């Protein structure tokens, strides 16, 4: 019963704040992807710059 009490207590917070927190967290994943894509685009450019050094 107390497990249900603690559970129902959690659901109260999760309904209001969890909606916003999901949106904030999903943004944070995008920010990880944006940083990763920037590093990828840095890296892919650098590899192709190296290839132009190789080719020349």
């Amino acid at each position: 019963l107390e497990h249900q009490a603690v559970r129902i207590e959690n659901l109260e917070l999760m309904s209001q704040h969890g909606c916003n927190a999901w949106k904030v967290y999903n943004e944070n994943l995008v920010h990880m992807i944006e940083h990763a894509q920037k590093e990828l685009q840095k890296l892919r450019k650098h590899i192709q710059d190296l290839n132009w050094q190789r080719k020349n």
Partner: peptide, 13 residues
């Protein structure tokens, strides 16, 4: 900022 994954499933058991 670390976040549960998800909270809706979760309970102590």
């Amino acid at each position: 900022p670390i976040r549960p994954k998800p909270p809706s499933a979760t309970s102590i058991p």
